[PDB]
Write a protein that binds this ligand. Sequence first.
Ligand SMILES: Nc1ccc(CCCc2ccccc2)cc1
Length: 162
Amino acid sequence: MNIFEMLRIDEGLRLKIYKDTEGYYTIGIGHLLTKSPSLNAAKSELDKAIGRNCNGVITKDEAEKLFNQDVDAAVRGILRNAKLKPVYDSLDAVRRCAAINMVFQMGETGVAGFTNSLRMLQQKRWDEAAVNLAKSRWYNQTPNRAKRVITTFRTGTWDAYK
Ligand SMILES: Nc1ccc(CCCc2ccccc2)cc1
């Protein structure tokens, strides 16, 4: 198991525009296109992302290209973030994957919330961090996925994905 296999489990693969768990137009392996309710706006974003006229449909190769870019972008965002980088650097490789997973799903908009979770993770207080992480809109709205990610932070193993 690695971050690509982990996020492929959590996000799936769909080759036509679909709505994500929040109702937002998405394609591929969890590639968010737009939060606008306009399907036309989403199709424009898709064409811009692929560099061709797609009318809402892509191939698996193209979905995987966006996926590689999106994982890369999540990592690079963690490393540029003054609050996230020290915690990320403090973690082992498996727990780093859990961190990338959360930033893939939610961007960096939830860093100020999760301040306390971040401190517990840096302190390696794993059971306490797991309790705090679950006290969240994230957990309530996507509980099965959050439970998998939280188990990964708690244990440093892939048990929740096997
Ligand atoms: N949006 C959002 C972004 C970040 C978090 C913090 C938990 C994940 C993480 C843990 C360690 C290092 C980097 C990221 C929560 C919400």
